[PDB]
Design an enzyme around this catalytic site. Structure first.
Site, PDB file in Angstrom:
ATOM      1  N   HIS A  20       0.818  -1.218   0.000  1.00 44.75           N
ATOM      2  CA  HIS A  20       0.000   0.000   0.000  1.00 44.75           C
ATOM      3  C   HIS A  20       0.845   1.259   0.000  1.00 44.75           C
ATOM      4  CE1 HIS A  20      -3.983   1.881   0.644  1.00 44.75           C
ATOM      5  NE2 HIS A  20      -3.335   2.798   1.346  1.00 44.75           N
ATOM      6  N   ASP A  22       0.371   5.398  -1.219  1.00 42.12           N
ATOM      7  CA  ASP A  22      -0.642   6.389  -1.621  1.00 42.12           C
ATOM      8  C   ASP A  22      -0.110   7.506  -2.518  1.00 42.12           C
ATOM      9  OD1 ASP A  22      -3.427   5.860  -0.642  1.00 42.12           O
ATOM     10  OD2 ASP A  22      -2.406   5.734   1.305  1.00 42.12           O
ATOM     11  N   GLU A 123      -9.042   1.425  -1.905  1.00 41.94           N
ATOM     12  CA  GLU A 123      -9.040   1.526  -0.454  1.00 41.94           C
ATOM     13  C   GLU A 123     -10.388   1.974   0.092  1.00 41.94           C
ATOM     14  OE1 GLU A 123      -5.978   3.977   1.433  1.00 41.94           O
ATOM     15  OE2 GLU A 123      -6.176   2.794   3.269  1.00 41.94           O
ATOM     16  N   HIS A 150     -12.825   2.118   4.491  1.00 48.66           N
ATOM     17  CA  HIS A 150     -11.761   2.982   4.962  1.00 48.66           C
ATOM     18  C   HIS A 150     -12.051   3.303   6.442  1.00 48.66           C
ATOM     19  CE1 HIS A 150      -9.129   6.683   5.144  1.00 48.66           C
ATOM     20  NE2 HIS A 150      -8.296   5.688   4.876  1.00 48.66           N
ATOM     21  N   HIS A 191      -8.147  -1.664   7.903  1.00 47.53           N
ATOM     22  CA  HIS A 191      -9.222  -0.701   8.225  1.00 47.53           C
ATOM     23  C   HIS A 191     -10.511  -1.260   8.800  1.00 47.53           C
ATOM     24  CE1 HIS A 191      -7.522   3.195   7.037  1.00 47.53           C
ATOM     25  NE2 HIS A 191      -6.872   2.515   6.110  1.00 47.53           N
ATOM     26  N   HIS A 212      -2.053  -3.076   4.824  1.00 48.32           N
ATOM     27  CA  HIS A 212      -1.266  -2.217   5.715  1.00 48.32           C
ATOM     28  C   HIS A 212      -1.848  -2.259   7.132  1.00 48.32           C
ATOM     29  CE1 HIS A 212      -4.291   0.458   3.951  1.00 48.32           C
ATOM     30  NE2 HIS A 212      -3.967   1.484   4.724  1.00 48.32           N
ATOM     31  N   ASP A 320       2.664   2.038   3.706  1.00 45.86           N
ATOM     32  CA  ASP A 320       1.780   3.207   3.771  1.00 45.86           C
ATOM     33  C   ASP A 320       2.492   4.502   3.366  1.00 45.86           C
ATOM     34  OD1 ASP A 320      -0.873   4.068   4.050  1.00 45.86           O
ATOM     35  OD2 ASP A 320      -0.434   4.931   6.037  1.00 45.86           O
TER      36      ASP A 320
HETATM   37  N1  LIG Z   1      -5.065   6.638   2.435  1.00 43.55           N
HETATM   38  C1  LIG Z   1      -4.516   7.205   3.685  1.00 43.55           C
HETATM   39  C2  LIG Z   1      -5.482   8.211   4.331  1.00 43.55           C
HETATM   40  C3  LIG Z   1      -5.442   9.626   3.813  1.00 43.55           C
HETATM   41  C4  LIG Z   1      -4.260  10.347   3.671  1.00 43.55           C
HETATM   42  C5  LIG Z   1      -4.286  11.659   3.203  1.00 43.55           C
HETATM   43  C6  LIG Z   1      -5.492  12.249   2.868  1.00 43.55           C
HETATM   44  O1  LIG Z   1      -5.508  13.555   2.407  1.00 43.55           O
HETATM   45  C7  LIG Z   1      -6.674  11.553   3.003  1.00 43.55           C
HETATM   46  C8  LIG Z   1      -6.644  10.244   3.472  1.00 43.55           C
HETATM   47  P1  LIG Z   1      -4.258   5.749   4.756  1.00 43.55           P
HETATM   48  O2  LIG Z   1      -5.642   5.138   5.168  1.00 43.55           O
HETATM   49  O3  LIG Z   1      -3.462   4.757   3.938  1.00 43.55           O
HETATM   50  C9  LIG Z   1      -3.342   6.244   6.229  1.00 43.55           C
HETATM   51  C10 LIG Z   1      -4.019   5.912   7.586  1.00 43.55           C
HETATM   52  C11 LIG Z   1      -3.127   6.466   8.695  1.00 43.55           C
HETATM   53  C12 LIG Z   1      -3.117   7.988   8.807  1.00 43.55           C
HETATM   54  O4  LIG Z   1      -4.217   8.560   8.694  1.00 43.55           O
HETATM   55  O5  LIG Z   1      -2.022   8.539   8.981  1.00 43.55           O
HETATM   56  C13 LIG Z   1      -4.387   4.428   7.740  1.00 43.55           C
HETATM   57  O6  LIG Z   1      -3.995   3.619   6.872  1.00 43.55           O
HETATM   58  O7  LIG Z   1      -5.059   4.111   8.716  1.00 43.55           O
HETATM   59 ZN   LIG Z   2      -4.065   4.696   1.931  1.00 45.15          ZN
HETATM   60 ZN   LIG Z   3      -5.220   3.095   5.072  1.00 47.74          ZN
END
Ligand SMILES: N[C@@H](Cc1ccc(O)cc1)P(=O)(O)C[C@H](CC(=O)O)C(=O)O
Ligand SMILES: [Zn+2]
Ligand SMILES: [Zn+2]
Length: 393
Positions: A20, A22, A123, A150, A191, A212, A320
């Site tokens: 994963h 982003d 996701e 999510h 998630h 992740h 991540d």
């Molecule tokens: N897709 C990311 C969320 C995101 C990031 C940036 C944004 O503008 C919007 C959404 P993520 O779910 O991969 C990261 C998250 C931990 C965190 O928040 O740090 C988790 O995995 O649980």
């Molecule tokens: Zn993500």
């Molecule tokens: Zn995530």
């Protein structure tokens, strides 16, 4: 040679399949997909965790690129198509370094020619807008896993970071899992609530993944995986891809984040409030309590326990990167993986153990999804069911 030198040698033979990253969302947010402005053929360390040179330095041989979109905004399907288009454009722009991969065989073909196999994972189930045909369209476009939620519940599945909703998967949620099994799309249980994990493991006829997530026994947080769920992975055949997020993996960071969130609420703000006024409050908290910093050792602690409970054949890595703001020391960007491999060598992990962790488990799991899909596609046609039919109006 040193453990770090040995780690790099091992990764050259069996590189990391990362679960994963982003980068696409980061490109959407930073430059609205103006790819020239964040050209990953150049050094993007000022802006991003990811670029091509750092991926190579890090020993990444395959990447599931996240096509995450926000569940709290309308137009999730359109946004998901934009995220998929971003991945396609990155692949097209960098043919020397990247190769599209839709299958386990494509992953091996990429490895044989020294290109990074580039896959896609959605996701959150909101990306299908309660539509099984939309799920099938995402698969047709190249999506090979979908995280069932999510951070918020959807109509048919419960998120770990929301209140109980349907109690795990609803009837339509089970239908989604069945259709993912028939298509060959991996069910991703990052998630989701523990109830949802158990319901998905009951329903799925294919190996599932956590793209992740780390260990709840090591660090009690709902984003991490309970031991009883890890124990079911051998039988299911799936894998848990450990993540690096400090506020999930380091006890001090879990506790700090909880205290920061409480402090926000004490000032009358929702813990996710990002207004200048809320930021002032948070800055004052960090001033009196500095943010704790995780290390490679922190992540290795999770992998050691996950190995004990799930087994070495049921582990992977999902960093991540570009999806979270903070990183462990030694894992500051996508070039960091050799540091983790070196720590594991120092803890006595074998070369074959490590080749499973990095490469072989992920390829086995995708191949298994393909195998289950062959059987189901031969046995029946696609589902025409609706959420109204299965869950009621
Ligand atoms: N897709 C990311 C969320 C995101 C990031 C940036 C944004 O503008 C919007 C959404 P993520 O779910 O991969 C990261 C998250 C931990 C965190 O928040 O740090 C988790 O995995 O649980
Ligand atoms: Zn993500
Ligand atoms: Zn995530």
């Amino acid at each position: 040679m040193t453990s770090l030198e040995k780690a790099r040698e091992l990764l050259r033979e069996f590189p990391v399949v990362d679960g994963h990253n982003d980068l696409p969302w980061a490109l959407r947010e930073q430059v609205r997909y103006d790819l020239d402005a964040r050209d990953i053929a150049a050094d993007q360390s000022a802006h991003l965790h990811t670029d091509l040179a750092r991926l190579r330095s890090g020993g990444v041989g395959a990447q599931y690129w996240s096509v995450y979109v926000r569940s709290d905004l309308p137009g999730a399907v359109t946004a998901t198509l934009e995220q998929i288009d971003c991945v396609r454009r990155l692949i097209d722009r960098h043919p020397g370094e990247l190769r599209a991969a839709l299958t386990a065989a494509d992953m091996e073909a990429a490895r044989a020619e020294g290109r990074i196999a580039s896959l896609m994972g959605a996701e959150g189930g909101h990306s299908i807008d309660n539509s099984l045909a939309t799920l099938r369209a995402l698969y047709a476009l190249g999506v090979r896993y979908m995280t069932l939620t999510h951070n918020d519940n959807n109509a048919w599945a419960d998120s770990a970071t929301d209140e109980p909703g349907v109690g795990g998967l609803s009837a339509f949620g089970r239908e989604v899992v069945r259709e993912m099994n028939r298509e060959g799309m991996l069910v991703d249980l990052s998630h989701v609530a523990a109830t949802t994990m158990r319901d998905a493991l009951d329903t799925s006829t294919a190996p599932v993944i956590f793209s992740h997530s780390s260990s709840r026994a090591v660090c009690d947080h709902p984003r991490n995986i309970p031991d009883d769920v890890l124990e079911r992975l051998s039988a299911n055949g799936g894998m848990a891809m450990v993540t690096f997020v400090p506020k999930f993996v380091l006890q001090a960071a879990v506790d700090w984040t909880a205290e920061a969130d409480d402090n926000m609420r004490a000032h009358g703000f929702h813990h996710l409030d990002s207004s200048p006024e809320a930021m002032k409050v948070h800055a004052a908290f960090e001033e009196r309590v500095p943010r704790p910093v995780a290390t490679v050792s922190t992540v290795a602690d999770h992998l050691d326990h996950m190995r004990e409970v799930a087994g070495v054949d049921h582990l992977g890595i999902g960093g991540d990167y570009d999806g979270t703001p903070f990183t462990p020391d030694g894992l500051g960007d996508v070039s960091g993986y050799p540091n983790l491999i070196a720590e594991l060598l120092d803890r006595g992990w074998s070369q074959s153990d490590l080749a499973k962790l990095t490469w072989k488990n992920a390829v086995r799991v995708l191949d298994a999804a393909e195998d289950v899909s062959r059987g189901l596609r031969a046995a029946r046609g696609p589902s025409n069911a609706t959420i109204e039919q299965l869950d009621g109006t």
